[PDB]
Structures are given as C-alpha cells and as structure tokens.
Amino acid sequence: SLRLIATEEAVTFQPVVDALRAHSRTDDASLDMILVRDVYGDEPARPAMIGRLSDVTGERLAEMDSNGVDMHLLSLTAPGVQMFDAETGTRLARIANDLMAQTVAANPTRFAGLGTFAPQDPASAAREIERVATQLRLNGLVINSHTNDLYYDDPFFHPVFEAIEASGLALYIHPRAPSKQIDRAFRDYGMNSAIWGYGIETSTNAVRMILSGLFDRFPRLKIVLGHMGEAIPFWLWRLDYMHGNATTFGGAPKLKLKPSEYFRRNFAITTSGVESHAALRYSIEVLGPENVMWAIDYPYQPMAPAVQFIRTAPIPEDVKAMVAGGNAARIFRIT
Amino acid sequence: SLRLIATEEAVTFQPVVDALRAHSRTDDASLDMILVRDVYGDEPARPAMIGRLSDVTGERLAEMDSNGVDMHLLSLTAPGVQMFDAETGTRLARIANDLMAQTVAANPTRFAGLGTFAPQDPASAAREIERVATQLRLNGLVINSHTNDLYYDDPFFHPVFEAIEASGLALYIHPRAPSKQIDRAFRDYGMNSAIWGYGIETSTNAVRMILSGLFDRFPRLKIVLGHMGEAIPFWLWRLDYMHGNATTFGGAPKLKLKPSEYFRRNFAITTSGVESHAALRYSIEVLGPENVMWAIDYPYQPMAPAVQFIRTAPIPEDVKAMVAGGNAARIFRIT
Ligand SMILES: COc1cc(C(=O)O)cc([N+](=O)[O-])c1O
Ligand SMILES: COc1cc(C(=O)O)cc([N+](=O)[O-])c1O
Ligand SMILES: [Mn+2]
Ligand SMILES: [Mn+2]
C-alpha cells in the first residue's frame, strides 16, 4: 500500500572505484582520506563496502523486496568525483552519469537516479548539468558538500548554480568529511564521519549559501539536505533572530527574505540516518509536510529499521504517504 | 505567580572591561577579537553594550520588575577571562568572582551567580573552583567553550574537571567564537557570532567531551548548555547510531553508556536565544522536563519576548514551573 521511495541511496561504479583505489595511495591531506582508505584502500578496514555499494540488482533489490520498498533514488557515493583533479573529475562524472542512466534504464520502476558533476571546473560542470537534465534525463543532481575546501557561497561556483537553476533539477547536497577549513577539530573519536563531522560540514555549507544571498541570485534553486536537514530545522529561530546583528555589524549582505524563509522556500530535507519520530514530527511542524522526505542511506544504514521507522510514524496516513514517497516523486520527477 | 529564574544572564565588571579594552589593541588572531573590538574597542560598533553588561541594579532590575522576572543567574560574559595569558587570567578570575559574590550579596533574592576560572592554568583554576564552591558559595560555574584553542576532552584539563566534579557545582559551558581549529569557515556573513559559529563551536566541544569518555572518568559532572542544548538534543539518535562505527573503526574509546545517555545523565539545557515552542516541546520530549531551563540571554536578547515565550508555552502548568525556575533552583542551588 504505502509507496516507499528511498532518497539517499548510495551506489558506485567500477571506473570510480578504480580511481579511488589509486587515490587511496596518495598523500592527499583531505579528511575524506580516512573513508577512502577504509573503503577503497589496499588494506581496507571496511572490505565489504565496495561490493555492497556496487550491487544494484542483487542483495540491494532482494532487500528492497523483503521490506516492501518500491524504489531507491541512487546517487554516486561520497566523495563522488570531487577529490580528483579537474580533468579527471570531469571525465569520470560523464562516465558515472552514463552508468547511472543505464542502471536506471535497466529497472526504471525500482530505480531513479541523481547525476553528479565535478565543480573543480565550474564551466565544464555547467555543461554536464545540462547534459544530465536534457540528454540523460536523470531525476536530479547530487554533490558532496565542499569542493577544493570551498563552500557554495563562493562566486567561483556561480556557473554551476546558474546551470542547476535553469535545469529545474533539485540538488541533493550530501555530506563529505569536514573541509580543510575546519577538519582540525574532527580528527578524533571518529568525528570525521557521520557521527558528527558530516553534519557540521554540510550544515555550515548550507548556512553560508543562505547568508551570502545565493538564493536571491538564484531564487528557483531547490536544495535537498539529508540527516533531518543537518539540524538546520532546529536552528531556524536563532538564524532569523540573529540575522539583524549579522547585517548590521557582521558584514552580512541584506537579503530579501529571512533565513528560515529561504530554508522553507528553497530547501527540502530527508530522514536519512535520523530514525526519530520526535525529530520527524518537529521537522514536519516547522517546515511543513511537503518538505520532508524519507530515505534509508543504504548501504551505510540497513533497510529494515528505516522502513519500520516510517511505517510506524505517529502521523496521519496522508502525511505519511507524502513523506514516504509522494514528496520525492514530485521533487525528483518520478512517475 | 510563575517563578522566573533566567539562567544565562551576562554581566561584566570594570577590571575585566579594562583588561579587554587593552586586549582589543593587540595582535591576537582569535576569532573572538571581532566581538572584543565591537564591544570593548576604542571605536566600538556596539558602544552601548559595556554599559548594559555592567548594569545590574538599574535598567536590568527595572526590566526584571516590569516583566515579572524573579531572578537573573549572572555570569561573566564571554569570552570571560580566557583570552588573557595564564597569570592575568588567573588574577582576573579571582577578582571577577569576588565582585560576582558581592553583586549577589547586595540583592540575593534577585540575583544568583556563577563563578568562572582560567583553564590556561588547570592547577590554579582547580584552586579557584574550590574557593568559588566553599568560600564564596556561588551557585555554579561558567566557562566559555574552548581555552587556548583546545577542547575539554584534552587531558590537560583533567585537574579542572576533577575539581568541578568534587565541588558539586554545575558548569555552564557558554559559547565563544569558533576556535582556531575551525575559525576559517566563520569569517564571513557575521558567522563568527551567535547566528552560527557560537553553536558549532560549543556543540563540537561538548560532543568531544562525551565521545572521549570524560563522563566515565567524572560521572558526577553536571554540564549546562544554552541555546536549546546547542542542537545536540536534535542529533541524539544519530550520535547513538553511529557510535558503533566510531568505536569499531574510528578509534573512539569504548564507553559505559550511549552518547545520548550521557547527554541525559550529565547535561541540562537552557532556552537562551531559542524562543521556539516547537523546539521547546521537542527538547522536553527527548530529554525529559527536568532537563530544560528557561533563560533570557540578557542583554544580548531583550527580556519581554523571552518572558512571554515561556509564559505562553503550550505545556502543562507544572512542567512550565519546572522550566521557568524549578529546575534552575535545583541545579544551581537557589532557595
Ligand atoms: C560515504 O558515504 C557515507 C558514509 C557513511 C559512513 O561511513 O558511515 C555514512 C553516510 N551517511 O550519509 O551518513 C554516507 O553517505
Ligand atoms: C559575548 O556574549 C554574547 C554575545 C552575543 C552577541 O554578540 O549577540 C550573544 C550571546 N549569546 O549567548 O547568544 C552572547 O552571550
Ligand atoms: Mn549518505
Ligand atoms: Mn549568552
């Protein structure tokens, strides 16, 4: 009965895996190298992960069937192609996107897909976004927080967002490990990863985007954040209240809307990795039921608990249907 | 009839003001220098703030009367004595605590006080904590997030927490600007301050404290966080879920409890600067009503809206009384 469309479902492809295996041996100081060595390195602490990410029609599909999940919206897993040099990243994004389109075409009632890009080269990424939207006709876009330790308020990335806005495709900004701007505080206790760094990195990116006025420049942008909006829904009152100080003595630019108004107008959120009925109810209350989507975060999270989380949510059936798949169908162009 | 005890009420004293005035002219690269110049500098963008912080029995007391506020729990305003060298910090802590105690004794039905300390010298700070507890008999302690760009998981600070635990005083960890470990990402759009940086800085300190096992070493510590717990209450499910990964391949130490269990056992929160009924309800639901306290954050926030926020909260009267002042009376030893 309930149509379940999971929105943050990671996948990988062999050309990207190979490039990341090679990257795991370099002296890259990016905090993402912890993940890259753990999953893609020569002595991996997480040896089963590559196979699980690569699999689409085997265990992944069997688990979807066992739990009554209708669809996964697939995305190239963090860190995508963003760790590579511009020419390499650009080349692999085209390849990964073609593979994604093929994967979707093989089972289009069970899989939708997000295309990615290499914002190392904003002009080439703009062209790829156009190809993803018009030729591949994928469902949306995905990028993993920062690129080159810069955030998306940086005017360097304007050609990207111009292309994204024109395409009408929603952009899922998924986490990656904290950038060099902040990674010093995240080297201990596994904080580089999902337990804390992922949220701080991604939420801070998003807040810079809002405060810089990116959404006055590109008002038709749709951004999607996982992990219950990387906690931004919790901070909305304070973001609004302190905005006056920010523009008065803080050097923030004057905006047409309040920060929380940009968040409700331009963002939607998913429940990936936050299987909390209390946090779900809060988000629905402050964002509206049209702005919340269910996700699993497979294979980093197991499907059964995520499915049972939404099936048992203490919300009316019509709101449940919206969160479970109705909103995703609208936002990511799924029939 | 509702007893209102505001728990995050900033004050300052002339010897600290004069030291910060001098500090504002120095080459300090700390991100707190933005605030320090704005408030304590020779050409201050916020020229009225010193007068408002310093005042206790004038405007502050009149505002308390006109809004029916019973008490302010006073704390030396951020950045406290933490920006000074060890010797100066240590000296100014003693002075500020003596002045705090005198301020309280002048109107003890209207003001309570938190003493501070200079963790730059952990051994000397341990001695001042004992003096605050047993000689001055102040109501608790306050410190402003990091010291020397180190967080409180660092073993360097063990003598401080040993002393705090033995004293039985609760420690309010108030924000200050993002430390040098993270400050690069907070130089724009006023993000150094309450709008974003304060929360990220303070919540990251607290998460390091929990994940490092500090509360296994000192299980009787009580920590208080303002700004609705710096959003940690929102992240509880994810902190718990991802902990297994953290201890399995992240190098985090094994803990006796789950991260959220430390947060409920060892932390309480205040509502300073988060006047959201939705966020209040969420926090009460996931932490329990004994763990949430009302505050104003005067003079950085005005009293009337904070007061009306709690007076109109959609919670039962007995829970409202706990939040408004009952919990604070317990946690901070107020009759
Ligand atoms: C590399 O992609 C991810 C890795 C992890 C993890 O290492 O646990 C978690 C998520 N996540 O979204 O929480 C990720 O998508
Ligand atoms: C120096 O202390 C504070 C300053 C500000 C501000 O500059 O707006 C806000 C708060 N606050 O707690 O949100 C502070 O305590
Ligand atoms: Mn993910
Ligand atoms: Mn404050």
Q: Domain residues of chain A, as ranges?
A: 1-335
3-state SS of chain B? CCCCEEEEEEECCHHHHHHHHHHCCCCCCCCCHHHHHHHHCCCCCCCCHHHHHHCCCCHHHHHHHHHCCCEEEEEECCCCCCCCCHHHHHHHHHHHHHHHHHHHHHCCCCEEEEECCCCCCHHHHHHHHHHHHHHHCCCEEEEECCECCECCCCHHHHHHHHHHHHHCCCEEEECCCCCCCCHHHHCCCCCCCCCCHHHHHHHHHHHHHHHCCHHHHCCCCCEEEHHHHHCHHHHHHHHHHCHHHHHHCCCCCCCCCCHHHHHHHHEEEECCCCCCHHHHHHHHHHHCHHHEECCCCCCCCCHHHHHHHHHCCCCCHHHHHHHHHHHHHHHCCCC
Q: Which residue has the tokens 């995305």?
A: A75
d(CA A327, CA A231): 20
What are the backbone dihedrals phi and psi of residue B188, each rounded to the nearest 5 degrees, phi first? -120, 155
Ligand 1 lined by A193 (C-beta under 6 Å):
yes
- Round to the nearest angstrom and report the end-to-end CA distance of chain A: 16
Tokens of residue A304, six digits: 């059964």
Who among B192, B249, B278 is closest to A46 (CB)?
A: B249
Taking alpha carbons only, the member of B178, B183, B176, B174 closest to residue B225 is B174
Which ligand 1 atom sits nearest the alpha carbon of residue B245? 8
Region for residue B288 given its phi and psi (left: phi exceeds 0; alpha: psi -120 to 50; beta: otherwise): left
> Among A92, A96, A93, A84, which residue's Cα sits nearest to residue A32?
A84
What is the CATH code of the structural domain delimited by B1-335? Answer: 3.20.20.140
Which of B36, B176, B198, B225 maximizes ligand 2 atoms within 8 Å of its Cβ, making it the mutation to test the pocket? Answer: B198
- A155 prior amide bond cis, ω within 30: no
Backbone angles phi, psi at A300, to 5 degrees: -75, -20
Reply yes or no: is the peptide bond before residue B253 cis, omega within 30 of 0: no
Ligand 3 (single-atom ion) residues, CB below 5 Å: A 8, 297
The DSSP output letter for A156 is G
Nearest residue to A284 (alpha-carbon basis) of A323, A236, A226: A323
Determine the Cα–Cα distance for residues B175 and B46; give it in Å rounded to an integer. Answer: 19
The SS3 call for residue A75 is: strand
Identify all chain B residues contacting A211, using CB atoms and an 8 Å cutoff: 188-191, 195-196
Nearest to A271 by CA among A316, A220, A327: A327
- For ligand 3, the distance from its centroid to the CA atom of residue A175, given in whole angstroms, is 7
How many angstroms separate the most distant Cα atoms in chain A?
57
Q: Which residue has the tokens 């929990």?
A: B210
* Residue tagged 């295309």 (tokens): A115
Residue among A131, A150, A37 nearest A93 (CA): A131
Task: Give all strands of the β-sheet with B71-76 in edge-to-edge order.
Answer: B5-11, B71-76, B111-115, B140-144, B171-174, B223-225, B267-270, B292-293
- Please give the Cα distance from A165 to A113 (Å, whole number): 18
- CB–CB of B238 and A199 under 8 A? yes
Task: Tell the burial category of A88 from Cβ atoms under 10 Å away from its Cβ (0-12, 13-18, 19+).
Answer: middle
A297 marked ligand binding residue: yes
- Chain A residues close to B245, C-beta within 8 Å: 190, 193-195
Record: contact A241-B285, CB cut-off 8 A: no
Nearest to B301 by CA among B31, B33, B8: B8
| Nearest-5° Cα angle at A75, A69 to A76 | 135
Using CA atoms in the order B321, B322, B324, B327, what is the torsion angle rounded to 10 degrees? Answer: 150
Let me know if A297 is a catalytic residue: yes
Catalytic residues of B: 297
| Rg of the Cα atoms in chain A | 19
